[PDB]
Amino acid sequence: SAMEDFVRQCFNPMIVELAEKAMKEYGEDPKIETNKFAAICTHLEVCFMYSDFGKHRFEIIEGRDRIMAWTVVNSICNTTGVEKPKFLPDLYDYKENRFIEIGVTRREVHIYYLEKANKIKSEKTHIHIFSFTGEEMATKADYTLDEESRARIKTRLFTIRQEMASRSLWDSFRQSERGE
Ligand SMILES: O=c1cc(Br)[nH]c(C2=NCCN2)c1O
Ligand SMILES: [Mn+2]
Ligand SMILES: [Mn+2]
């Protein structure tokens, strides 16, 4: 139906294949859990943009299989002494020397920030939350990126939102917490 079609028009093949593998892992069907499909693609693409806006400053951990992701986190810990996270984060920042958790929410950015902060309960992992309304929230209000990069992410999220809205998919998507 329409959600899968939108996902295939708007995200590039590699992001789609990754998100489908992420679904198959749990046991989820992208033709059924279409909002989650879309949410997974959107989070993947934001993580990749964030990382590409970096000598590379960021290490992408999101998108790898679990073995490789924990291998990367483990390597970074052993070579920096940075404390190991309890949950797989999304990126490592070699400039600030900290892991980053990236949130993408359809609700208020502060609501989701509190949710993430309460979940990961690690004072060391930096948290950065983007909404589809051009809003952000980050630990200590440290946004890591320069204005143009954060703006490119904001524009892309809002675009995804407006594309769902013109297809009439947005209301189902923002009323669903699935994918956050
Ligand atoms: O932002 C996120 C929201 C949700 Br739900 N899951 C994850 C995740 N990272 C590694 C495995 N699962 C996020 O990074
Ligand atoms: Mn992640
Ligand atoms: Mn994340």
Please outline the helices and strands:
Layout: H1 2-10, H2 13-26, H3 34-52, E1 58-60, H4 66-80, E2 91-93, E3 98-105, H5 109-120, E4 126-131, E5 136-138, H6 147-166, H7 170-175
Largest sheet: 5 strands, mixed
How many domains, in number, for the residues?
1
Report strand %.
5-15%
Number of helices: 7
State the share of residues found in helices, binned by percent.
Answer: 40-55%
- For the terminal residues, how far apart are their CA atoms? 22 Å
Computed structural class? alpha+beta
Following the backbone from N to C, one meets helices and strands in this order, namely: HHHEHEEHEEHH
* Small molecules (ligands, ions, cofactors) in the structure: the ligand O=c1cc(Br)[nH]c(C2=NCCN2)c1O, manganese (II) ion
Protein name: Polymerase PA
Organism: Influenza A virus (A/Japan/1070/2009(H1N1))
PDB class: viral protein,hydrolase/inhibitor
Keywords: Drug discovery, metal-binding pharmacophore, isosteres, influenza endonuclease, VIRAL PROTEIN-INHIBITOR complex, viral protein, HYDROLASE-INHIBITOR complex
